[PDB]
Amino acid sequence: TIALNNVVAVVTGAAGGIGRELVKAMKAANAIVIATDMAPSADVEGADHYLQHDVTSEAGWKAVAALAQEKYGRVDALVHNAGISIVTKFEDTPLSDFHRVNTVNVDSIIIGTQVLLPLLKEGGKARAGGASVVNFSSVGGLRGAAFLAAYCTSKAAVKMLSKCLGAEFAALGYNIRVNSVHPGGIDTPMLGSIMDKAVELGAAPSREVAQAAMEMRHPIGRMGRPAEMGGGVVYLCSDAASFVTCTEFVMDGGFSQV
Amino acid sequence: TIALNNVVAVVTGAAGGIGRELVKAMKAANAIVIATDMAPSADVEGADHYLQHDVTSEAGWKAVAALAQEKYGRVDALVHNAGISIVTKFEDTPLSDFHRVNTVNVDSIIIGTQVLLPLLKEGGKARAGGASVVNFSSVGGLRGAAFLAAYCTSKAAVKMLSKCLGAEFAALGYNIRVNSVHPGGIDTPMLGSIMDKAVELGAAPSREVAQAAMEMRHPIGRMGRPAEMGGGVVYLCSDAASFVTCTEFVMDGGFSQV
Amino acid sequence: TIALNNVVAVVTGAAGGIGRELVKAMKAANAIVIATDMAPSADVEGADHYLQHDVTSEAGWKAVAALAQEKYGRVDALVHNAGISIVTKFEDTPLSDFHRVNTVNVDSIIIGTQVLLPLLKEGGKARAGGASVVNFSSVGGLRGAAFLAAYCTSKAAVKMLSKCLGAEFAALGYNIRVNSVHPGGIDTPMLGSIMDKAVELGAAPSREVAQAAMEMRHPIGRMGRPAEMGGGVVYLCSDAASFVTCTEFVMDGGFSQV
Amino acid sequence: MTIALNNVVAVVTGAAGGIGRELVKAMKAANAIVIATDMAPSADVEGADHYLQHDVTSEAGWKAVAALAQEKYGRVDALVHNAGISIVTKFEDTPLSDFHRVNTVNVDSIIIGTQVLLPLLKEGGKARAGGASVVNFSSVGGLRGAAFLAAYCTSKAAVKMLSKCLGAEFAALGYNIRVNSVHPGGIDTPMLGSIMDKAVELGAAPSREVAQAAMEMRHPIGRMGRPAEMGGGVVYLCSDAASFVTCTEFVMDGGFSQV
Amino acid sequence: MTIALNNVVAVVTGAAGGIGRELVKAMKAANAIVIATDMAPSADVEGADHYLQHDVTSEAGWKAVAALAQEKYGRVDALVHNAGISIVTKFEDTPLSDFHRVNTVNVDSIIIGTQVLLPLLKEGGKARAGGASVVNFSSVGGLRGAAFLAAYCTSKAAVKMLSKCLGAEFAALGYNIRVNSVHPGGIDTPMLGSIMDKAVELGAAPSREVAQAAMEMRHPIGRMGRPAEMGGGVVYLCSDAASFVTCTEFVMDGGFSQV
Amino acid sequence: TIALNNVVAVVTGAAGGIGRELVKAMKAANAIVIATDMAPSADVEGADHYLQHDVTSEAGWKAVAALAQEKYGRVDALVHNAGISIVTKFEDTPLSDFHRVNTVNVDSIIIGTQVLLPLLKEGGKARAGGASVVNFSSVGGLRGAAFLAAYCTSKAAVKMLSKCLGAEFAALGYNIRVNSVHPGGIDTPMLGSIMDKAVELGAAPSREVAQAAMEMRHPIGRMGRPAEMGGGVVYLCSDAASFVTCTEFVMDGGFSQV
Numbered sequence A, B, C, F: 001t002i003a004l005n006n007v008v009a010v011v012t013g014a015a016g017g018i019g020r021e022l023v024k025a026m027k028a029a030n031a032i033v034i035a036t037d038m039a040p041s042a043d044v045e046g047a048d049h050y051l052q053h054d055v056t057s058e059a060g061w062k063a064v065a066a067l068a069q070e071k072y073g074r075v076d077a078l079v080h081n082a083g084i085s086i087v088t089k090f091e092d093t094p095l096s097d098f099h100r101v102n103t104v105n106v107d108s109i110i111i112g113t114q115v116l117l118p119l120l121k122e123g124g125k126a127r128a129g130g131a132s133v134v135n136f137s138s139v140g141g142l143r144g145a146a147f148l149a150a151y152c153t154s155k156a157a158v159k160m161l162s163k164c165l166g167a168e169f170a171a172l173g174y175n176i177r178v179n180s181v182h183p184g185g186i187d188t189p190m191l192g193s194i195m196d197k198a199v200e201l202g203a204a205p206s207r208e209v210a211q212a213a214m215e216m217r218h219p220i221g222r223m224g225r226p227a228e229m230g231g232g233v234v235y236l237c238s239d240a241a242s243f244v245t246c247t248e249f250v251m252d253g254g255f256s257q258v
Numbered sequence D, E: 001m002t003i004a005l006n007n008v009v010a011v012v013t014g015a016a017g018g019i020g021r022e023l024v025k026a027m028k029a030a031n032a033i034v035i036a037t038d039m040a041p042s043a044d045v046e047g048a049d050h051y052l053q054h055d056v057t058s059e060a061g062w063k064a065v066a067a068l069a070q071e072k073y074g075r076v077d078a079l080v081h082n083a084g085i086s087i088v089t090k091f092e093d094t095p096l097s098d099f100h101r102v103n104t105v106n107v108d109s110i111i112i113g114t115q116v117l118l119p120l121l122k123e124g125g126k127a128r129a130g131g132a133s134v135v136n137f138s139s140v141g142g143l144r145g146a147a148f149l150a151a152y153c154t155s156k157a158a159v160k161m162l163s164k165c166l167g168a169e170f171a172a173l174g175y176n177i178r179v180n181s182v183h184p185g186g187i188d189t190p191m192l193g194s195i196m197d198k199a200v201e202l203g204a205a206p207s208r209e210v211a212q213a214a215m216e217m218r219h220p221i222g223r224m225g226r227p228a229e230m231g232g233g234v235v236y237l238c239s240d241a242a243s244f245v246t247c248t249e250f251v252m253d254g255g256f257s258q259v
């Protein structure tokens, strides 16, 4: 069946709403989890290790690589879950706001995957199914939205980078699977901020009309819970997903398909 | 834990290449499996029941509903895996060949889902995550191909029917998730026949050049194995996929994404 | 530039809301237009010929082929614009309602293209850019919707048949381009009926709430006008579109992309 | 001609390139007034009413384009972001600065240029019921990934999504500005030439002849596109005939993305 | 489809000669990739994608052809053995070494060349359902004897029979390689010119005008052929349209052999 | 290339296995095709005209001449493809069976060529390469066979008549090329009947042993397909064959040469 026995996993943004549930779900499937986030310390349920880690910092990633190299000699699963959102009027958005969103959401994947590539190649030799890189995109990487230009653009970049790396790592014989995950509206502080900033921009009349509109756009009729992201990430990280690479893995309550 | 504890599952085309692996995988996750196919009897490893079942027959589906109703009182998971393929020159394809492919690949889902809907509504009350309907489409439902007009058209119909039923069942409050599965080239008798018929048509120079070309179109660089379909179907049927409806679930080695 | 000089065009459903505007637009670009519909006679502005034509009838299509063969010796452009819609509850929809929608929307393209294929091959020799087959799909062929299972399934079939025929006709050297057109909500009797039947079904509270909801789902903020379909069809039929085949040509005010 | 650009003031970037020259010819043939821009200090661009030296990465360069359009016409009806670059690289040997260089030319060009020309595009939006038209050059590479094209493909997917967001935002704010992405397949230009050669040097393809034949066969139509085959599509998107077309992926790829 | 050589990698020997130049033009016009070879260190062969210096009697020369085809394309779809010589002699004054010289160019060329290119032709056999195509230049002289042409006629009959044997053998071994012989009549080239002049010097003919008229009258069509009239036949044999043609005598002789 | 631009072509036995493929191939090379056979009507793809035509009837040939004269003023290509076979014991074959085979296979060419000669002379003026007469002989016109005395004798007569007419038309300055075509075993109803009658005669043990024996006599190792006759006939009819007259054009998979 679907398990992560003898899987050494790195999860970024691990102290966030989705991140904490990914760590719990992956531990429950018997993974060894290195959890990382911006805080100098955190109590992340299911983590075997916590590291302070700015995903924009090559030095931060080298510290993750050093701990994994010393303690395990490989990385089997890399979950790029760290990200930010802004809600802005395009004409009032300086180029530096696009660049800040790009640095956290996309450069994180480029720097992190380059630094951990030797360790992922070892993951590729440890399991016939391959090492697994899971990149957090969004339904915002599939469908546009007014006032989300910077966020949506970065999440479409994440999606396409996933396809290119899946194809490249397979062509070079590294046995590393790369997939993008596309959550719908998930009940976390990030969705909260986006909704509030939508109201202050005057995109929505009130926070109640905004919430009801967003809920109704999902065919399933509600926001997702962070725990509903866990199974999908466990599946992609497992040998059960040995024929899954370059894929858009959608967990959006039907949002993108209507 | 991605599991199918207390899940009553119906799997059609269960004696086929993928079907046998679906039954094994679902039993291994603790499902009760009603396996069905065209043969009057079959030894399907992991099946609790086997029924002779032509998926084009309303009477055949009523016999499946009667056994499930009598023995369990619900259906938690319905896997529409039965399907056929033809390879033909469009101009030499009579309308009756399109209709034959449509009857097995699409009408099966319409008739079967209508007949089992009362039992799926009971599945919807038995699990918070919902009853799960899994429709076998294809990468051929996403991307066209010369000489596969009848097959590809039917698999695109399967894909869109999945989106419509997911949205409709959610709007009516039935708590039934509906998803389409899109396998790439999977090593089964069906792929074998398609490749041989492609050679006889003169679409491919030889069966060796056809095989190498098809393998190279997959970024992962090979055909899939039937067992590689099992985990994905178990995930979609489980409560772990409670936020997954109307979705294209792709298991294609990256075929569709390059 | 974009023109249809010396283009012999067949347009089905030519007496409908979009059809009449397609005939006007194509005449204005200097096409010779054979207009066809169900009525025994019609005054279709811009038509050089009108034929009574049931697109579900092989005999009806042979009569179109005979007139084109006798008067011009080729067909340069074939616009499959004839189509119907129903709005229904899936569980109350007999298989015969799916079949009726399939026969008009899909079998029309299969029968018509097979019957006109010799004449389209002559179109393929008359213009370097190729003969052009334009199939009317829908945003309903791209995105699912509650209560539109029969319609959406048929329009996804139209879309995929277009991809397969584009690829097949190119592989066989016929120089015939095939593309699908995907209108959003266009202000015609068909959209009118769908909205009214949605009210009678109880899918929408009132015809005013339905209209406002459908308008708001389009980023552009309104229904399309039938005339807004004309330029796109003229483009696809012209030599300006010589590198366009197998394509989804979307005219939906942004509907599918948010 | 019934699809036309009468009284359309058009800005076309990368106008001296393979596709750009054909866009200018096609748009002039549909009666547009064309401001052509590229990196060269001077160029003879057939159909251009004006040529400006213009680095699309420069806010100051864009302000000079805005000043000429403002002074001579008082509006911009059509903005074609056609300037772009490609690189072909091994991901693990690609410094972050190479991703940033590709992003700056292919994406920041659209952000800076559209911000600077927004007042003039708003005037375009008042001049035609159909709206001002912004046409962003993405790629089939913005729809489908490819080994060794990580930096290029990522930038072209960003272009595609930015197009959808701006189409939706400009409509929500009532500016009457249509925004669409164009997705060419393999078009016979120096850019496709360089990509194929660099693919050989990287050892992605055995020879330049096997690479060319493989790329041609991936297109159902069975050949590369010619630059002229991009012209009609861009004319259509810029015209009032496309008044119901915004946020759209406009594909001119010989069927590449659909098989 | 029709008769075409799309994605056909073709080797043509004696490509700088009268017939050879027309074969290269005709095969390029049908969209073949043509590797042209002849004795000159360089030549301007219209329609050739590559020219190689190549003595068809040299195993090393053939290995250089195989290396270029292997490196650039990975297969050979069509091999046209067009290189040949003629002599006109009195049998009793013809040393064994003159027979051997004609045999080496006209026959050993086909044996050495086909053996060296066989791995590449097997790949041609996998690339097309119709098969790789080997086209051997025989002659009406390989069908009908003639006074004073003993060395030439003997070599051209050997070419004809080798073609039948290789067609049958390659089919029995499952290689999917078609082999056919081509039998031109009198074609207006330097070779026909020399044969006629040497016939006069030998005292076979009174004058070059009486020789020409006699040879023309032997052809029912009433004239010599033009080199361009060989092109279509070779294109046909090299194409998938000839998928049921192997071991065959393909005659282009104005009726010479049939009266 | 090799093409039939502005070529007016008459093809007899055009509704048969090879004949239908000849018409398709010749239309694909841009010929104007007058297709003829014994049925009062037929749908022959690529035919510009169909005529009911018994090739043994001078009156039937005059009707072909009248249509060509009225509509085009010339014939550029004449394909004598109509023929029959019998399989018999010589000693049980009455003289009238030899005469019936001679009338269809040989007298057809004599009558047809005499009646169309004025129109063929005009074709000789219309193209430098000449009018082209293509006579269907057989490998049976080159090599004898037990039980095929009547058929083989007629096909050798066809072959020699071709040589004589090629030489005579050139001597008289008409610019009309005449060639014989020699198919091997081609997969058509005619080969089917010959094989079955070979079994009934007791020439072969079974229809499977007969088929395998006949296939093995062809060096290429199989029967030909009717489509494999097309390119050869197009070549002979084209200006590319301007130096080809009196010739045996063999399409026999090597049958005659081992």
Ligand SMILES: NC(=O)c1ccc[n+]([C@@H]2O[C@H](COP(=O)([O-])OP(=O)(O)OC[C@H]3O[C@@H](n4cnc5c(N)ncnc54)[C@H](O)[C@@H]3O)[C@@H](O)[C@H]2O)c1
Binding pocket: A012, A013, A014, A015, A016, A017, A018, A019, A036, A037, A038, A053, A054, A055, A056, A080, A081, A082, A083, A084, A085, A104, A136, A137, A138, A139, A140, A182, A183, A184, A185, A186, A187, A188, A189, A190, A191
């Ligand atoms: N919540 C949703 O509706 C939703 C929808 C689509 C996609 N996503 C994606 O899911 C992922 C997780 O989002 P979430 O809802 O859990 O949000 P969250 O903000 O709750 O968690 C994100 C975490 O990322 C961390 N982080 C931010 N910048 C960092 C940096 N430079 N270095 C290291 N860590 C950094 C934050 O500290 C935070 O703990 C993100 O990539 C987000 O874009 C979420």
Ligand SMILES: NC(=O)c1ccc[n+]([C@@H]2O[C@H](COP(=O)([O-])OP(=O)(O)OC[C@H]3O[C@@H](n4cnc5c(N)ncnc54)[C@H](O)[C@@H]3O)[C@@H](O)[C@H]2O)c1
Binding pocket: B012, B013, B014, B015, B016, B017, B018, B019, B036, B037, B038, B053, B054, B055, B056, B080, B081, B082, B083, B084, B085, B104, B136, B137, B138, B139, B140, B182, B183, B184, B185, B186, B187, B188, B189, B190, B191
């Ligand atoms: N194998 C591939 O490469 C591939 C690719 C994409 C899609 N698929 C789909 O996956 C599913 C399983 O395919 P597979 O590869 O195992 O093929 P398979 O032929 O091995 O199995 C299909 C089964 O369907 C059964 N079946 C056919 N018609 C039926 C009918 N009328 N009633 C009941 N049963 C019927 C057959 O008996 C067979 O057991 C199919 O829907 C197929 O189209 C497979």
Ligand SMILES: NC(=O)c1ccc[n+]([C@@H]2O[C@H](COP(=O)([O-])OP(=O)(O)OC[C@H]3O[C@@H](n4cnc5c(N)ncnc54)[C@H](O)[C@@H]3O)[C@@H](O)[C@H]2O)c1
Binding pocket: C012, C013, C014, C015, C016, C017, C018, C019, C036, C037, C038, C053, C054, C055, C056, C080, C081, C082, C083, C084, C085, C104, C136, C137, C138, C139, C140, C182, C183, C184, C185, C186, C187, C188, C189, C190, C191
């Ligand atoms: N109007 C929209 O909102 C919308 C949206 C998506 C796509 N479309 C598609 O665009 C096309 C044009 O639709 P419209 O809006 O003009 O609808 P319409 O009903 O105004 O026109 C459709 C025409 O089809 C004809 N028709 C129906 N069945 C026929 C048959 N069997 N044989 C021949 N003619 C037949 C009708 O007589 C009518 O003239 C259709 O294919 C439709 O599905 C329209």
Ligand SMILES: NC(=O)c1ccc[n+]([C@@H]2O[C@H](COP(=O)([O-])OP(=O)(O)OC[C@H]3O[C@@H](n4cnc5c(N)ncnc54)[C@H](O)[C@@H]3O)[C@@H](O)[C@H]2O)c1
Binding pocket: D013, D014, D015, D016, D017, D018, D019, D020, D037, D038, D039, D040, D054, D055, D056, D057, D081, D082, D083, D084, D085, D086, D105, D137, D138, D139, D140, D183, D184, D185, D186, D187, D188, D189, D190, D191, D192
């Ligand atoms: N040719 C293809 O196959 C292909 C495929 C898909 C997409 N595209 C896209 O189409 C567009 C046209 O490309 P092309 O094929 O004509 O290539 P090209 O290189 O011939 O033209 C691109 C032009 O952009 C200009 N340019 C580059 N950087 C610039 C800068 N900083 N400031 C101003 N001008 C700058 C160059 O000077 C050049 O003239 C590009 O966006 C390209 O990415 C091309």
Ligand SMILES: NC(=O)c1ccc[n+]([C@@H]2O[C@H](COP(=O)([O-])OP(=O)(O)OC[C@H]3O[C@@H](n4cnc5c(N)ncnc54)[C@H](O)[C@@H]3O)[C@@H](O)[C@H]2O)c1
Binding pocket: E013, E014, E015, E016, E017, E018, E019, E020, E037, E038, E039, E054, E055, E056, E057, E081, E082, E083, E084, E085, E086, E105, E137, E138, E139, E140, E183, E184, E185, E186, E187, E188, E189, E190, E191, E192
């Ligand atoms: N011209 C005729 O009447 C006639 C008749 C029947 C057969 N053919 C045959 O057609 C073919 C072409 O003849 P053509 O008339 O064009 O003659 P040609 O002399 O014009 O050309 C023959 C070519 O072969 C080349 N060649 C000779 N020895 C060679 C060697 N050792 N290695 C490589 N190249 C070598 C010559 O340099 C020349 O370019 C020959 O095989 C000839 O025998 C010609």
Ligand SMILES: NC(=O)c1ccc[n+]([C@@H]2O[C@H](COP(=O)([O-])OP(=O)(O)OC[C@H]3O[C@@H](n4cnc5c(N)ncnc54)[C@H](O)[C@@H]3O)[C@@H](O)[C@H]2O)c1
Binding pocket: F012, F013, F014, F015, F016, F017, F018, F019, F036, F037, F038, F053, F054, F055, F056, F080, F081, F082, F083, F084, F085, F104, F136, F137, F138, F139, F140, F182, F183, F184, F185, F186, F187, F188, F189, F190, F191
């Ligand atoms: N098929 C083989 O194996 C083979 C081998 C050698 C040569 N051939 C020759 O090829 C040609 C085509 O044969 P096929 O295999 O297509 O057979 P076929 O029987 O399918 O076609 C022959 C056609 O000739 C027509 N015909 C017969 N008598 C006629 C008459 N009196 N007037 C007009 N039409 C008449 C028939 O109606 C038929 O349509 C014939 O000349 C045949 O002898 C066939």
